[PDB]
Design a protein around this ligand. Structure first.
Ligand SMILES: Cc1cc2nc3c(=O)[nH]c(=O)nc-3n(C[C@H](O)[C@H](O)[C@H](O)COP(=O)(O)O)c2cc1C
Ligand SMILES: Cc1cc2nc3c(=O)[nH]c(=O)nc-3n(C[C@H](O)[C@H](O)[C@H](O)COP(=O)(O)O)c2cc1C
Lengths: 386, 386
């Protein structure tokens, strides 16, 4: 039972008032159309998690533009249809009494090179380096080999971030827009020494490696306001060739500088809505630098993560707790954690089941059974919302 | 009783085998002659602190050269008489079975401008900034105003560090030489954004502000070897205008970069003898970055620090514990801490009493009385060891 704790104490984030501090972190599921349009399945998916919640939801990582991708059946906030669909999802989430932020995705050297090629797009990264020999062979066989971004492509990346942020906040009505700068995707690639060998002002130092992220953040803040902006960082992660603690420059220095710059912008009157961090190594130093709302995610609902949930959410008055994997299998997770009711185990084998309701909408509420793989919803084909 | 803890477990530091991990941190006392030569009182002082100890003694912050000073009756390892006196002290310390390091001092904008003036020396800093209006005042009346160092004064500084290091290690026989890069003196002034406004290679970035320290470190490494070199850092200190956590760039990023670079030199086969550190402020990130011997100092004997002493010294097998203020009172502090014997209180009013044995050699070992100020030892005028 966690109703006793700060986890269900209201908190002001940005300009909105969250009823609790439990967050659904961005969780990629690939239930969009092949056109990258949000579906009715996704609408019900976020609707059930906005019901009886009052808290914050964060969308699956969403491509800001075609060049920001691509993965098959991923999300996008680019075309008119996509913005319409996401707008309807937002309107339903708000009707439910919850709030929602959209995380913006940019793959970089992590993208599907064949799909990008079929959409006539190059395969871009800070430097012409692959994170694995597997990816190198994949890009070479697709005829779409990785390229170091030109200055023009970086400028276009910034403009695309601005356009996607405006579409999310102003057209679709999201409460925040979250810049995905973690897990070895494009912005992280610019941050990481392992991925960034550039010798212009976007590489070669801590300030230079963090430059693209900070410029995107500044342009987006100018576009939609700091209280509608967020960012996610993963200093210790080694996913997709990121250096973690093994980087030639320690992540405490690099990401320490990033956090210092965000806190400086906050000291100049541009305070981000929140900074999202992944629990491992210890994140305490991060909380030393950033003084605003911090969303901490990872492990908190395991058979040992509990009582670090209590400790961390009660440690101060600015901490949000994110639970992703159990939120996928528990659409009523806020009430189950509120009342201390047993959780439904999550099923990793259906995390990325492309364009299928099986393991996506088959989960029941507390005390209700899991619908089987041959049920009506499990075999119903998702339909685009616009 | 602390004999059971790691505080009294042997440990290898550099080439040296320390029988315990209690350390006498560098403690300025100003009992040298007016021409900065070590003194017989100092020999008896360090000698008493070397008996029944076997630990590491760290010498009072010592001027590497006349330009590195100046303070009244401060120490220096520049002239042949000075090196010979310090050699006598080192021979006595080794004879008594303990080991000793010399900390090298460079005042910069913290110096006495009147004294420097009287020695025909300028008043140097990274930038033409005083740490206080009082210092500005004393400098302007002595007609020795602060000057931003030229490139050749920087080069001469590094050469002087090399010369002082070779003097201490190879001639005087010190076990290691510690570079003072803390508490707002010259190297810290280069590190701090509050004091370093340089636009050249030595300022305007994390890497640029740390450049002089790392260059000096590398040169001294080349001179005397890595296991004969150490460094002290005070990321949180705000002494003499240092920025602390209020710096434009957070000290976790800056000193995080410094520690990452030192650990990088360790990865390449040049592992410093130890890193000396001072102390939501918390030095845990420092231990996340630096993996070698770390000497932690500050406040460890308050009956609120005894627990932090046991905790920090037992947390791993590479932690030394420094105790300065109580070591000034208890020349047999190793035995007292080893057997839980009550400590003689310290007298700050005689910490900096110039050229006097009173409150310097009047301390008795456990079970003996403090000699009064009219005793034979207290009235003696100290003589140079030359
Ligand atoms: C299937 C799946 C998809 C995810 N997608 C994203 C994503 O798109 N963006 C992101 O920042 N994190 C993503 N994550 C990481 C989660 O947001 C979260 O940080 C991680 O699962 C740890 O939290 P947890 O222990 O509560 O599950 C994903 C995780 C999973 C399991
Ligand atoms: C009188 C006095 C002189 C000191 N001189 C130096 C010095 O020359 N160099 C230095 O790095 N620290 C110096 N320190 C700081 C100590 O080395 C130590 O970090 C500080 O006193 C905290 O340790 P403690 O709590 O055990 O006393 C001095 C401290 C005192 C009280």
């Amino acid at each position: 039972p966690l109703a006793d704790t700060n986890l269900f104490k209201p908190i002001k984030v940005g300009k909105i008032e969250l009823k609790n501090r439990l967050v659904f972190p961005p969780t990629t599921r690939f239930r969009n159309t092949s056109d990258f349009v949000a579906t009715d399945s996704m609408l019900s998916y976020y609707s059930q998690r906005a019901e009886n919640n009052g808290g914050l939801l964060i969308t699956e990582a969403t491509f800001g533009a075609p060049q920001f991708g691509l993965y098959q059946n991923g999300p996008m906030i680019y075309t008119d249809r996509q913005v319409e669909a996401w707008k309807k999802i937002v309107e339903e989430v708000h009707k439910k009494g919850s709030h929602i932020s959209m995380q913006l995705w940019n793959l970089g050297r992590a993208a599907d090179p064949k799909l990008l090629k079929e959409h006539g797009l190059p395969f871009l990264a800070p430097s012409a380096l692959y994170f694995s020999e597997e990816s190198k062979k994949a890009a070479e066989e697709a005829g779409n080999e990785v390229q170091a971004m030109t200055l023009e492509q970086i400028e276009q990346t910034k403009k695309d971030y601005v356009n996607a942020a405006k579409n999310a906040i102003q057209k679709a009505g999201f409460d925040m827009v979250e810049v995905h700068s973690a897990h070895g995707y494009l912005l992280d690639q610019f941050i990481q020494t392992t991925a960034n060998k550039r010798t212009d002002k976007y590489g070669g130092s801590i300030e230079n490696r963090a430059r693209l992220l900070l410029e995107v953040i500044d342009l987006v803040i100018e576009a939609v306001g700091a209280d509608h902006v967020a960012v996610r960082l993963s200093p210790y992660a080694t996913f997709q060739g990121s250096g973690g603690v093994d980087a030639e420059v320690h992540p405490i220095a690099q990401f320490g500088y990033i956090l210092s710059e965000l806190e400086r912008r906050a000291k100049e009157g541009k305070r981000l809505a929140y900074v999202s961090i992944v629990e491992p190594e210890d994140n305490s130093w991060m909380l030393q630098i950033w003084k605003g709302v911090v969303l901490r995610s990872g492990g908190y609902l395991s058979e040992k993560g509990i009582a670090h949930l209590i400790k961390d959410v009660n440690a101060d008055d600015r901490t949000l707790i994110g639970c992703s994997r159990y939120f996928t299998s528990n659409p009523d997770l806020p009430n189950r954690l509120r009342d201390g009711l047993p959780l439904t185990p999550y099923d990793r084998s259906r995390f990325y089941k492309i364009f299928s309701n099986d393991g996506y909408l088959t989960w029941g509420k507390y005390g209700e059974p899991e619908q089987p793989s041959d049920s009506a919803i499990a075999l119903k084909t998702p339909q685009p919302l616009a």
